[PDB]
């Protein structure tokens, strides 16, 4: 339990993550594996505890965005397979090999450069990304694949572990583009067949695709958002096959409370004035914590009541208009439950003109995370203590 | 200090040194500077910024909350540090033990601190007077009296200074600033009426310090101007000297492809190509603090402004280029590249926000490279530390 000295914190309920992974594992075929996707500081829940609980719940593999994230996991004693999903520079080849991290590799040019940087003994695992319509990274054309495979002839130290694609629209109700991607991916698999390469270990499905569609499980699925207990989109939420259990909540405490006379200003540039004598509370969280200025006017929870953020959000603090005096130290919930009220990360996202993924994942490293298992605090991680 | 993705922040320590030096020479010789390093030094990193600011003549540091102060203490910084934000009473002993001053302004805080005191430590505090910011601080005379009463039972709390903060010092027109100033003088009069010397008075942030007479008192608290950025566009022409931006943000072309006419880019196919287009991908996204609302913003590639196309993803985004470039081509998101410069303000304007928010929210997962005399002197990759 790392110490922390501001009463602002994230709570991660490891039971929720465990349950979500267990439920997805039950839902997919028995011969299909789960990559627990922990990119972006585990979508703001913290790399290591999420990886550990997901593995305990039956995920067998992990995925991250870039190599440094994988190394966090390795230094924590995790030995499960780890795949980097984003692109990596060729200079990463020996370090990834040494740390048993597979990279996404999909360019002849990368292979050409890796040959130049290879230490002459390391074997690095890779997965081919096929771009079937996401348009981000990955191979798109047959002749492109051919060239890539030709370059690999000069790089025996690169060992294919698997092959994958990613869906751009699986969280949309209408499924035309998803169907096109699926058909394109099968065409792309047939290029490998033509060129004499076994894809070995095929994976396509994110949370949305996994929880919707038949016949896209292949050998493994890659679960991010649903593991954290949130719907990939508002439009598919109503028809998920079972209830997802949100893992993350975000809380602070009333740091000051005062009665502000009618007409007085609150915060930078005096964008709010009290309409009567008003109870104004202040809390020690702000945009440096990832709680952005665009959340001005959003309603947080105090005593199970929705109360608005008033005046400009500052770097480290914001102000709230309460109906009644409350004691200093009163719990203020930004994401989560008080009484019969619940503020979801999606509701925060909607007010903010964004998506839940971005809200959770941008909660700053300066905010401590408290980890709960069976209702009890089992770990506190305060990254500020580490730096 | 190693890092394994070609995405990074560069912090020019010369720029910070020069800004602090210029402020020091602009203000009276008997006025101290707090280097304000809250929010991971506005995204530039707590420790190197504290170090260079002190070298340049700042004498004190300020942070938002106690954990930030402890980062500095663990790094061997020994200069005074003040926590500007509120702190829970349970912080009393740890603050004292680490020679950190807290902002204290509530009888209730003192009452609780008395309960939690370890019985030996002495803690320094500054009184915050709220002269119109409406955030924290004492507002009323009777409230001040109750606070001083409560102190009679807490002989282990030691006054180090008194301050307020301006809400509108970055606005051209000055009515609200003048109102706060007059209110603050009244609040100081109350303190002096109650027999208490304020000892060490400070009020001015970057905008107030650079603009106004009679508000330097004993010290000024500099954030944004230390980092080389104007508190606002509207006061930028009024600044007494040129500020030198310290922070830039870069990445490299990680993929490049020619995408046929009509094909989709990124989630929900919000962009389709008009012709056969060159589309580049870079390894930075919203988990790095580069938000979805920057879709359509123009970044710099080979000294040319080129648009972000399709939805920004967690760790990557795409760019439409007029021509093929090699893998590894530098992409600049904030700062200078060739014949172009993108200010944090420009990013902020497109984003519907302010420069402060842009720089401060660059994630701890992005490495910072520190430049002094045109040379790399330090690399900090917080991911290696956790
Ligand atoms: C983000 C990501 C995932 C996880 O997606 P969710 O919607 O969070 O399930 C899976 N695969 C790739 C390639 C990703 O980028
Ligand atoms: C943020 C802050 C500062 C620094 O303000 P700049 O505009 O960045 O100079 C000074 N004092 C207090 C109390 C602050 O919160
Ligand atoms: Cl992809
Ligand atoms: Cl189906
Ligand atoms: Cl304040
Ligand atoms: Mg008044
Ligand atoms: Mg309560
Ligand atoms: Mg339980
Ligand atoms: Mg007395």
Taking the C-alpha atoms of residue B41 and residue B47, their distance in angstroms, rounded to an integer, is 8
Beta bridge partners of A223: A36
Determine if residue A287 is labeled as part of a ligand binding site.
Answer: no
The position carrying tokens 């939805």 is B311
Ligand 1 pocket member A225 (CB < 6 A): yes
Taking the C-alpha atoms of residue A9 and residue A19, their distance in angstroms, rounded to an integer, is 23
List chain B residues with CB under 8 Å of A168: 264, 266-269
Query: For residue A260, which of A276, A238, A283 has the smallest C-alpha distance?
Result: A276
Domain with CATH 3.20.20.10 in chain A: 14-227
Taking the C-alpha atoms of residue B332 and residue B340, their distance in angstroms, rounded to an integer, is 10
Q: Give this entry's resolution in angstroms.
A: 1.5
- What CATH topology corresponds to A1-13+247-387? Lyase, Ornithine Decarboxylase; Chain A, domain 1 (2.40.37)
Structure tokens at B80: 């005074």
Instruction: Determine, for residues B5 and A364 on separate chains, whether the beta-carbon distance falls below 8 Å.
Output: no
- Counting Cα atoms < 13 Å in the Cβ hemisphere of A241 gives 16
Is the distance from CB of B62 to CB of B39 less than 8 angstroms? no
| Three-state secondary structure call for residue A88 | coil
Interface test with A, best of B1, B2, B5 (most A CBs within 10 A): B5
Instruction: Determine, for residues A68 and B365 on separate chains, whether the beta-carbon distance falls below 8 Å.
Output: yes
Determine if residue B351 is labeled as part of a ligand binding site.
Answer: no
As a three-state string, the secondary structure of chain B is CCCCCCEEEEEEHHHHHHHHHHHHHHCCCCCEEEEECHHHHHCCCHHHHHHHHHHHCCCEEEECCHHHHHHHHHCCCCCCEEECCCCCHHHHHHHHHCCEEEECCCHHHHHHHHHHCCCCCCEEEEEEECCCCCCCCECCHHHHHHHHHHHCCCCCEEEEEEECCCCCCCCCCCHHHHHHHHHHHHHHHHHHHCCCCCCCEECCCHHHHHHCCCCCCCEEEECCCCCCCCCCCCCHHHCCCCCCCCEEEEEEEEEEEEECCCCEECHHHCEECCCCEEEEEECCCHHHCCCHHHCCCEEEECCEEEEEECCCCCCCEEEEECCCCCCCCEEEEEEEECCEEECHHHHHHHHCCCHHHHHHCCCCCCCEEEEECCEEEEEECHHHHC
Query: For residue B378, which of B35, B22, B21, B46 has the smallest C-alpha distance?
Result: B46
| Angstroms from B269 CA to nearest CA on chain A | 7
CA distances from B262 to A143, B257, B273 (A): 20, 14, 5
Q: How far is the CA of A140 from the centre of ligand 1 (A)?
A: 19
CA distances from B305 to B8, B277, B313, B359 (A): 19, 16, 20, 20
Taking the C-alpha atoms of residue B367 and residue B356, their distance in angstroms, rounded to an integer, is 19
Structure tokens at B330: 């530098």
Cβ contacts of residue A14 below 8 Å, gap of 6+? A49, A53, A247, A371, A372, A373, A378
CATH superfamily for domain B1-12+246-386 = Lyase, Ornithine Decarboxylase; Chain A, domain 1 (2.40.37.10)
Structure tokens at A126: 């890779």
Cβ contacts of residue A254 below 8 Å, gap of 6+? A281, A282, A283, A302, A326, A327, A328, A329, A330, A332
Determine if residue B45 is labeled as part of a ligand binding site.
Answer: no
Taking the C-alpha atoms of residue B198 and residue B189, their distance in angstroms, rounded to an integer, is 10
Q: How far apart are the first and last CA of chain A?
A: 16
Structure tokens at B293: 């609302």
Class of domain A14-227: alpha beta
Is the distance from CB of B253 to CB of B237 less than 8 angstroms? no
Chain interruptions in chain B, by residue before each (C–N > 2.5 Å)? none
Query: For residue A27, which of A57, A64, A62 has the smallest C-alpha distance?
Result: A57
- What radius of gyration do chain B's Cα atoms show? 24
Class of domain B13-226: alpha beta
Which mutation among A85, A221, A236, A247 tests ligand 1's pocket best, with the greatest number of atoms within 8 A of CB? A85
- CA B364, B369, B372, B373 dihedral sign is negative
Beta bridge partners of A327: none
Ligand 1 pocket member A206 (CB < 6 A): yes
- Counting Cα atoms < 13 Å in the Cβ hemisphere of B310 gives 27
Cβ contacts of residue B125 below 8 Å, gap of 6+? B101, B102, B103, B104, B157, B158, B159, B160
Q: List phi, psi (to 5°) of A129.
A: -95, 125
Active site residue A39: yes
Residues with CB under 5 A from ligand 3 (ion): A 134, 136, 166
Q: Is A176 an interface residue toward B (CB < 8 Å)?
A: no
Instruction: Determine, for residues A168 and B266 on separate chains, whether the beta-carbon distance falls below 8 Å.
Output: yes
Catalytic residue among B24, B38, B51, B252: B38
Please tell me which of the candidates B6, B268, B357 has its beta carbon nearest to residue A89: B6
**Considering only residues 186 to 245 of chain B, which have any Cβ-Cβ distance to chain A shorter than 8 Å?**
none
Cβ contacts of residue B370 below 8 Å, gap of 6+? B10, B11, B13, B45, B48, B376, B377, B378, B379, B380
- Provide the experimental method for this PDB entry: X-ray
The maximal CA–CA distance of chain B, rounded, in angstroms, is 79
Active site residue B267: yes
Is the distance from CB of A210 to CB of A308 less than 8 angstroms? no
Taking the C-alpha atoms of residue A297 and residue A305, their distance in angstroms, rounded to an integer, is 15
Q: How far is the CA of B204 from the centre of ligand 9 (A)?
A: 30
Taking the C-alpha atoms of residue B48 and residue B13, their distance in angstroms, rounded to an integer, is 8
CA distances from B176 to A31, B51, B180, B188 (A): 68, 35, 6, 18
Domain with CATH 2.40.37.10 in chain A: 1-13+247-387
Neighbours of A385 (CB within 10 A): 17
Is the distance from CB of B347 to CB of B276 less than 8 angstroms? no
Q: Is B108 an interface residue toward A (CB < 8 Å)?
A: yes
List chain A residues with CB under 8 Å of B131: none
Domain with CATH 3.20.20.10 in chain B: 13-226
Instruction: Determine, for residues A255 and B38 on separate chains, whether the beta-carbon distance falls below 8 Å.
Output: no
| Three-state secondary structure call for residue A387 | coil
Q: What count of CB pairs under 8 Å joins A to B?
A: 255
Interface test with A, best of B1, B4, B109, B266 (most A CBs within 10 A): B4
Determine if residue A207 is labeled as part of a ligand binding site.
Answer: yes
| Three-state secondary structure call for residue A290 | coil
**Ligand 2 neighbours by CB, cut-off 6 Å:** A 315; B 36, 84, 165, 205-207, 221-225, 231
Taking the C-alpha atoms of residue B141 and residue B187, their distance in angstroms, rounded to an integer, is 7
Neighbours of B350 (CB within 10 A): 16
Ligand 1 pocket member A127 (CB < 6 A): no
The per-residue b/e assignment along B127-139, b for 16 or more CB within 10 angstroms, e otherwise, is: bbbbbbbbbbbbb
Taking the C-alpha atoms of residue A74 and residue A101, their distance in angstroms, rounded to an integer, is 9
Is the distance from CB of A265 to CB of B167 less than 8 angstroms? yes
């Amino acid at each position: 339990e790392a110490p922390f000295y501001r009463d602002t914190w994230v709570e991660v309920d490891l039971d929720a993550i465990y349950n979500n992974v267990t439920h997805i594992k039950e839902f997919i075929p028995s011969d299909v594996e789960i990559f627990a996707v922990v990119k972006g500081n585990a979508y703001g829940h913290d790399y290591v505890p999420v990886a550990k609980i997901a593995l305990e719940a039956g995920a067998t593999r992990l995925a991250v965005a870039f190599l440094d994230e994988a190394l966090v996991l390795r230094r924590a004693g995790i030995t499960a397979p780890i795949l980097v999903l984003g692109p990596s520079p060729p200079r990463d080849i020996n370090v990834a090999a040494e740390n048993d991290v597979a990279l996404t590799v999909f360019q002849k040019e990368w292979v050409d450069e890796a040959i130049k940087l290879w230490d002459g003994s390391s074997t690095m695992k890779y997965h081919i990304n096929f771009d079937s319509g996401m348009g981000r990274i990955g191979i798109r054309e047959r002749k492109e694949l051919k060239g890539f495979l030709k370059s690999l002839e000069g790089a025996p130290f690169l060992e294919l572990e698997g092959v994958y694609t990613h869906f751009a629209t699986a969280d949309e109700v209408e499924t035309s583009y998803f169907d096109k991607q699926y058909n394109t991916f099968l065409e792309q698999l047939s290029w490998l067949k033509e060129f004499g390469v076994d894809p070995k270990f095929v994976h396509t499905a994110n949370s949305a695709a996994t929880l919707r569609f038949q016949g896209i499980t292949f050998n493994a699925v890659r679960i991010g958002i649903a593991m954290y207990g949130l719907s990939p989109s508002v439009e598919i939420r109503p028809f998920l096959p079972f209830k997802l259990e949100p893992a993350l909540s975000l809380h602070t405490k009333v740091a000051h409370i005062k009665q502000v006379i009618k007409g007085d200003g609150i915060s930078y540039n005096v964008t709010y004035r009290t309409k009567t004598e008003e109870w104004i509370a202040t809390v020690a969280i702000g945009y440096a914590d990832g709680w952005l200025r665009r959340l001005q006017g959003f309603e947080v929870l105090v005593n199970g009541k929705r109360v608005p953020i008033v005046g400009r959000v500052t770097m480290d603090q914001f102000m709230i208009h309460l109906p009644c005096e409350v004691p200093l130290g009163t719990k203020v919930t930004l994401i989560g439950r008080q009484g019969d009220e619940y503020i979801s990360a999606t509701e925060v996202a909607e007010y903010s003109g964004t998506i839940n993924y971005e809200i959770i994942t941008t909660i700053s490293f300066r905010v401590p995370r408290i980890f709960i298992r069976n209702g009890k605090v089992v770990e506190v991680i305060n990254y500020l203590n580490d730096i």
